[PDB]
Amino acid sequence: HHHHHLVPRGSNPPPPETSNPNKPKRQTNQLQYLLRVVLKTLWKHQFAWPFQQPVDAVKLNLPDYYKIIKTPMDMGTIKKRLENNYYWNAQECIQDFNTMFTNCYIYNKPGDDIVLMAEALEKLFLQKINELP
């Protein structure tokens, strides 16, 4: 038989939602600080770039990524969520940050460059989190 299964092809999943009209939302000073100070300083860092958008498993050649990571998260998604006032409190936003870092440590091993980048950002994240209102 001549069907060699060259199609159907692989793909990336739909990225996480940055809007939800029915979701409860607020603008708190902690959430404003998370956008104004915490997100924007992590975003400017030289190790930020791999975390600034959802993982493209096809482009980056990580076809096992969404087999292992079932709750993906990135700083681009958190930035859009903060800009759209998507969160109810700081805990929801901080949990997204925690998910992003945890995904990186689950998927990769100690010593990998991406983990060294994640640890540096987490170190810096936790310092900025200590100065929350």
How many Å apart are CA 4 and CA 64, to the nearest integer?
Answer: 21
DSSP state of 51: G
Phi/psi at 3 (5° precision): -80, 100
Q: Which is nearer to ligand EB7, 60 or 126 (CB)?
A: 60
83 near ligand EB7, rule: CB under 6 A: no
Burial environment of residue 38 by CB neighbours within 10 A (0 to 12, 13 to 18, 19 or more)? buried
Does 60 bind ligand EB7 (CB under 6 A)? Our answer is yes
CB of 85 to ligand EB7, least distance (A): 25
Preceding omega of 8 cis (within 30 degrees of 0): yes
Does 15 bind ligand EB7 (CB under 6 A)? Our answer is no
Angle at which helices 75-83 and 90-107 cross, to 10°: 170
By CB under 6 A, which span of 36-44, 90-98, 105-113, 124-132 interacts with ligand EB7? 105-113
The answer to the question of residue 124 lying near ligand EB7 (CB under 6 A) is no
Q: Does 51 bind ligand EB7 (CB under 6 A)?
A: yes
3-state secondary structure (DSSP) of residue 123: helix
Among 35, 41, 48, 50, binds ligand EB7 (CB under 6 A): 50
113 binds ligand EB7 (CB under 6 A): yes
Query: Which residues in this chain contact ligand EB7 in the complex, by CB under 6 A?
Result: 50-51, 55, 60, 62, 104, 107-108, 113-114, 117
